[PDB]
Design a binder for this molecule. Structure first.
Ligand SMILES: O=c1[nH]cnc2c1ncn2[C@@H]1O[C@H](CO)[C@@H](O)[C@H]1O
Ligand SMILES: O=c1[nH]cnc2c1ncn2[C@@H]1O[C@H](CO)[C@@H](O)[C@H]1O
Ligand code: NA
Ligand code: NA
Ligand code: NA
Ligand code: NA
Ligand code: NA
Lengths: 298, 303
């Protein structure tokens, strides 16, 4: 199984019909299931992987997410629901041109360190994604002492790290996945160059938006092509769908060329739909699309 | 009675520890505390006028999904709901309000039932001697100005957060119909630019142009002269949300009771100072005896 550590949240995707006491009218709001862990586990589950979400919800409003996990067949064994607490929510204000500004209200995510990654059974692989700060650190420590290889994916939690804690997390990590902005930020905060970050992991994966991705590993760098999206509706969750694809690859022994292409394809499917988890390809569809884009079958 | 037309909304108020000025964009920031409060321009102004012992009749729309807490609060306050319309199968307006270290604010405002505010007709309201038209659904704002003018009810035009929805021609017309205009100093500039009128030109078309200046008080530009209104020192500074509306409540009370502009402005300034010492727009709760005594303390005389 794969252990998916990160936020579990409701996303409120608010649309500003355009692009000091200033208001912006947002006539439409759409509520969606989100959170980094929920999004990545959704992607891995689409592929037929066995995803075990580890994260915290708040009892006040956890139930829809729990019912959705049950409907999807996603195990709830490491999802802790905290009494008298609200679930994390992302207030995602989006304009005309898909740019976004999020106010994230962490709620129960602030207590994510109540879950201990080192107690999880039959975990072969993990990811440590954006979450409560204490929980992110704790999971990297417990997975390393447990000998479970993990992707470190600090994402929106990067500003909670200082130099020392971020360098330590990279030492412990087996892989790192980031976008280019985040790669720069990791470089700046650690005082390490990109070469030096890459030297400390089996692979450093950098997504390049609509232009595919780069996978740097010890003796080479893979350039991963993008896949042309069928329509561009909403980027929220693209990174996470990519990461679901990448983890499926790693767990199933794919080479980096293939793992990266699968991850690129999941990103491209995601962007054609509103919200992080409303794309719903079948595994047969994913295989056919992979062949159409790349000329071979995973 | 005084007809108070404007938004009725629930406010969700968050602080940001930075300054907005120094902060395909994918921007995410942590908001660790949020406080929910009763808000909306009409609810806030009516709350202020009612603190003073005025007879405030709110005119605005709520949504039936979640209106009940606000209707119960109105009833507990003794605020008439005669012109508060609750729209089936609709959500009430919600403001998502973030305040920075300089006390500037950015709001994402989800209008919900506010977009239907023109279902209320201000010209049908009975026993109304004065009114304000504050930020609301655009169609509602324009219709209330038209119907109040047609009915001969003197009103403050208070475009506020609604200003972006107005073009020059509509804003010029609205000022022509209005008896007073109230804006903050940033909004006064926006209005001068949109209309192509100077402040003096705008004041020539109303009985008074009232410009608030935050912690620096207010200016009332009128027929024969201009009053500079001092700020009142706050006892503590907790939240600016609703300061302008408290000020408007004080101003409406003074107008109704025939206060000179110097006194009406000072009362408004006092209400604003009391408001800022409390969270949200309506948690400040002075008594009328308190307001009279504070006014004497601050200003040297009784209103
Ligand atoms: O500060 C944060 N911490 C954790 N999760 C976040 C934060 N901001 C946004 N999201 C979550 O990120 C997902 C997209 O990858 C969204 O679904 C949102 O819920
Ligand atoms: O765009 C808007 N239209 C109408 N009302 C608004 C808007 N933005 C904020 N508020 C309301 O303004 C009050 C403070 O004066 C707040 O209570 C908020 O609900
Ligand atoms: Na990310
Ligand atoms: Na490492
Ligand atoms: Na205002
Ligand atoms: Na006029
Ligand atoms: Na002119």
């Amino acid at each position: 199984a794969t252990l998916i550590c990160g936020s579990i949240a409701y996303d409120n995707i608010m649309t500003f019909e355009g692009r000091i006491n200033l208001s912006f009218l947002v006539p439409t709001m759409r509520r969606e299931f989100g959170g980094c862990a929920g999004n990545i586990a959704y992607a891995l589950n689409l592929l037929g992987g066995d995803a075990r979400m580890m994260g915290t919800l708040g009892a006040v409003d956890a139930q829809p997410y729990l019912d959705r996990m049950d409907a999807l067949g996603l195990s709830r064994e490491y999802v802790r629901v905290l009494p008298d607490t609200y679930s994390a929510q992302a207030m995602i204000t989006t304009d005309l041109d898909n740019n976004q500004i999020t106010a994230f209200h962490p709620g129960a995510m602030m207590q994510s360190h109540v879950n201990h990654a080192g107690e999880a059974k039959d975990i072969k692989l993990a990811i440590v994604g954006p979450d409560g700060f204490q929980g992110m650190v704790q999971h990297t420590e417990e997975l390393a002492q447990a000998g479970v290889p993990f992707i470190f994916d600090p994402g929106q939690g990067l500003p909670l790290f200082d130099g020392a804690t971020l360098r330590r997390s990279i030492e412990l990590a087996t892989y790192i996945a980031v976008n280019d902005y985040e790669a720069k930020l990791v470089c700046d905060k650690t005082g390490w160059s990109e070469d030096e970050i890459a030297s400390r992991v089996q692979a450093l994966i950098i997504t390049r938006g609509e232009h595919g991705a780069t996978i740097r590993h010890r003796d080479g760098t893979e350039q991963i092509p993008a896949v042309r999206a069928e329509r561009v509706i909403d980027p929220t969750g693209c990174g996470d769908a990519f990461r679901g694809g990448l983890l499926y690859g790693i767990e199933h022994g794919f080479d980096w060329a293939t793992a990266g292409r699968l991850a690129s394809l999941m990103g491209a499917l995601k962007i054609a739909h509103q919200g992080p988890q409303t794309y719903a390809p079948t595994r047969a569809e994913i295989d056919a699309r992979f062949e159409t884009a790349f000329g071979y079958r995973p």
